[PDB]
Design an enzyme around this catalytic site. Structure first.
Site, PDB file in Angstrom:
ATOM      1  N   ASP A  36       0.794  -1.225   0.000  1.00 14.10           N
ATOM      2  CA  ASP A  36       0.000   0.000   0.000  1.00 14.10           C
ATOM      3  C   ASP A  36       0.832   1.283   0.000  1.00 14.10           C
ATOM      4  OD1 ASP A  36      -2.106   1.794   0.229  1.00 14.10           O
ATOM      5  OD2 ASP A  36      -2.520   1.325   2.332  1.00 14.10           O
ATOM      6  N   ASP A 232      -1.359   5.616  -5.504  1.00 17.73           N
ATOM      7  CA  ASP A 232      -1.797   4.739  -4.420  1.00 17.73           C
ATOM      8  C   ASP A 232      -2.138   3.323  -4.883  1.00 17.73           C
ATOM      9  OD1 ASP A 232      -2.835   3.598  -2.117  1.00 17.73           O
ATOM     10  OD2 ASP A 232      -4.642   4.859  -2.061  1.00 17.73           O
TER      11      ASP A 232
HETATM   12  C1  LIG Z   1      -6.674   7.909   6.229  1.00 13.30           C
HETATM   13  S1  LIG Z   1      -5.281   7.730   7.353  1.00 13.30           S
HETATM   14  C2  LIG Z   1      -4.820   6.050   7.127  1.00 13.30           C
HETATM   15  N1  LIG Z   1      -5.321   5.296   6.144  1.00 13.30           N
HETATM   16  C3  LIG Z   1      -4.956   3.987   6.082  1.00 13.30           C
HETATM   17  N2  LIG Z   1      -5.489   3.233   5.057  1.00 13.30           N
HETATM   18  C4  LIG Z   1      -6.495   3.864   4.207  1.00 13.30           C
HETATM   19  C5  LIG Z   1      -7.113   2.695   3.440  1.00 13.30           C
HETATM   20  C6  LIG Z   1      -7.641   3.278   2.142  1.00 13.30           C
HETATM   21  O1  LIG Z   1      -8.762   3.752   2.084  1.00 13.30           O
HETATM   22  N3  LIG Z   1      -6.780   3.304   1.064  1.00 13.30           N
HETATM   23  C7  LIG Z   1      -7.320   3.809  -0.203  1.00 13.30           C
HETATM   24  C8  LIG Z   1      -5.438   2.916   1.152  1.00 13.30           C
HETATM   25  N4  LIG Z   1      -4.638   3.176   0.147  1.00 13.30           N
HETATM   26  N5  LIG Z   1      -5.036   2.213   2.213  1.00 13.30           N
HETATM   27  C9  LIG Z   1      -5.930   1.714   3.269  1.00 13.30           C
HETATM   28  C10 LIG Z   1      -6.473   0.381   2.864  1.00 13.30           C
HETATM   29  C11 LIG Z   1      -7.319  -0.491   3.578  1.00 13.30           C
HETATM   30  C12 LIG Z   1      -7.678  -1.642   2.854  1.00 13.30           C
HETATM   31  C13 LIG Z   1      -7.123  -1.673   1.567  1.00 13.30           C
HETATM   32  C14 LIG Z   1      -7.339  -2.623   0.543  1.00 13.30           C
HETATM   33  N6  LIG Z   1      -7.490  -3.347  -0.328  1.00 13.30           N
HETATM   34  S2  LIG Z   1      -6.150  -0.275   1.283  1.00 13.30           S
HETATM   35  C15 LIG Z   1      -5.268   1.829   4.698  1.00 13.30           C
HETATM   36  N7  LIG Z   1      -4.137   3.366   6.954  1.00 13.30           N
HETATM   37  C16 LIG Z   1      -3.634   4.139   7.934  1.00 13.30           C
HETATM   38  C17 LIG Z   1      -2.782   3.452   8.959  1.00 13.30           C
HETATM   39  C18 LIG Z   1      -3.927   5.534   8.040  1.00 13.30           C
HETATM   40  F1  LIG Z   1      -3.280   6.350   8.892  1.00 13.30           F
END
Ligand SMILES: CSc1nc(N2C[C@H]3C(=O)N(C)C(=N)N[C@@]3(c3ccc(C#N)s3)C2)nc(C)c1F
EC number: 3.4.23.46
Length: 387
Positions: A36, A232
């Protein structure tokens, strides 16, 4: 150069994510971990969950160190909470090194673990600024660079199959490569073009022009980066700010107007199917995003095909897809369906991101993805959003 030990070390697909095998603890505990670039925590399942067939068992690791601190991470689409600690971490199909890294041991979660994704944790590769609980929790890649001689760079080749993969096929299939500490020349064709990393938090970039089949979307370039533009691997779609999405979908509908699709298709919710082998790729336009170059007043462009922005899904023998361009209220996100067209170099050492045509991008006999330049572009700093 050539990093044979790391080529073909990823599995997965754009919708569920791409993951790499890692080990944690002593003796090593193998886990599959989502790559990620969106994010900056290394967090793993550390308690039973219906969608996990394995998890990190801290009591079985002699090298586990408890940081005596909790971590609560609520984001838009989901959440998780856990306990911070450190342990010895390796990447079997990676650099031949073992590092002492921070691990958030996930004890409770909601809509985080995807049923059938085959991953048990997440490797956040972005910068410490966005790490949880705060920027003092050193991200994995920062630890790897500090403790070893691994160069401060990684590169990703995410390989979309171009058709749906069933449960067995997705486990047996090569999903791409994560080259840690280098650039593997077998993974791309043509030249690498670099765009500056605007600021080190997310992998932030600046888009300076957008075309649909060569037609300029003609918006003030600040709109393309409102309120940021990031690269991303953890997002499936190409996500665009509301106004840009509205203008782009109007232009994509106009270019593909010989076939009418329902509103649900353009909303990214409903699939569209065609008889086997008859997908009319040629009616859909190519999309070019121009990125700020490394030379003053210079830009370059990356061009994707409908084979990137139409995501294959199962329905029958029909070929079906979902539209993988969607709206955002948090800026542009160059997600997995964009990354599948290119080999992407996260050159942290030189604060730049490189793009080249991927050796595994899906195309047809008439069109290919492209990375081309240079173009003369003035006032590119004006394209960045402030406040
Ligand atoms: C908003 S602050 C934040 N956000 C995340 N994530 C956001 C998720 C998020 O919507 N996208 C877009 C991200 N690129 N990564 C995260 C994911 C969770 C599940 C995923 C799959 N398949 S990707 C983790 N992880 C941590 C630890 C954060 F501080």
């Amino acid at each position: 150069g050539s990093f044979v030990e790391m080529v073909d070390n990823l599995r997965g697909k754009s919708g569920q994510g791409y993951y790499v095998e890692m080990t944690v603890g002593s003796p090593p505990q193998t886990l599959n971990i989502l790559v990620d670039t969106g994010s900056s925590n290394f967090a793993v399942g550390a308690a039973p969950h219906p969608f996990l067939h394995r998890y990190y068992q801290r009591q079985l690791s002699s090298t586990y160190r408890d940081l005596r601190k909790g971590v609560y991470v609520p984001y838009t689409q989901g959440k998780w909470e856990g306990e911070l600690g450190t342990d010895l971490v390796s990447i079997p199909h990676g650099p031949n090194v073992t590092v002492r890294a921070n691990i958030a041991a996930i004890t409770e979660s909601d809509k985080f673990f995807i049923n059938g994704s085959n991953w048990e944790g997440i490797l956040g590769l972005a910068y410490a600024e966005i790490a949880r609980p705060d920027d003092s929790l050193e991200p994995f890649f920062d630890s790897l660079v500090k403790q070893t001689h691994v160069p401060n760079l990684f590169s990703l080749q995410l390989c979309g199959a171009g058709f749906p993969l069933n449960q067995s096929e997705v486990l047996a299939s090569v999903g791409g490569s994560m080259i840690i500490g280098g650039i593997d020349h077998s993974l791309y064709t043509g030249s690498l073009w670099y765009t500056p990393i605007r600021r080190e938090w997310y992998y932030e970039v600046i888009i300076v022009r957008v075309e649909i089949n060569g037609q300029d979307l003609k918006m003030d370039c600040k709109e393309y980066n409102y309120d940021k533009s990031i690269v991303d691997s953890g997002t499936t779609n190409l996500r665009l700010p509301k106004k840009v999405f509205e203008a782009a979908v109007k232009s994509i509908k106009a270019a593909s107007s010989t076939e009418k699709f329902p509103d649900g298709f353009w909303l990214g919710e409903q699939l569209v199917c065609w008889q086997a082998g008859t997908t009319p790729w040629n009616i859909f336009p190519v999309i070019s995003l121009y990125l700020m170059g490394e030379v003053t007043n210079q830009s370059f462009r990356i061009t994707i095909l409908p084979q990137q922005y139409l995501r294959p899904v199962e329905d029958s023998q029909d070929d079906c897809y979902k539209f993988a361009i969607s709206q955002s209220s948090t800026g542009t996100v160059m997600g997995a369906v964009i990354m599948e067209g290119f080999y992407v170099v996260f050159d942290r050492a030189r604060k730049r991101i490189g793009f080249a045509v991927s050796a595994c991008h899906v195309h047809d006999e008439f069109r290919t993805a492209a990375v081309e330049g240079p173009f003369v572009t003035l006032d590119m700093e004006d394209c960045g959003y402030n406040i």
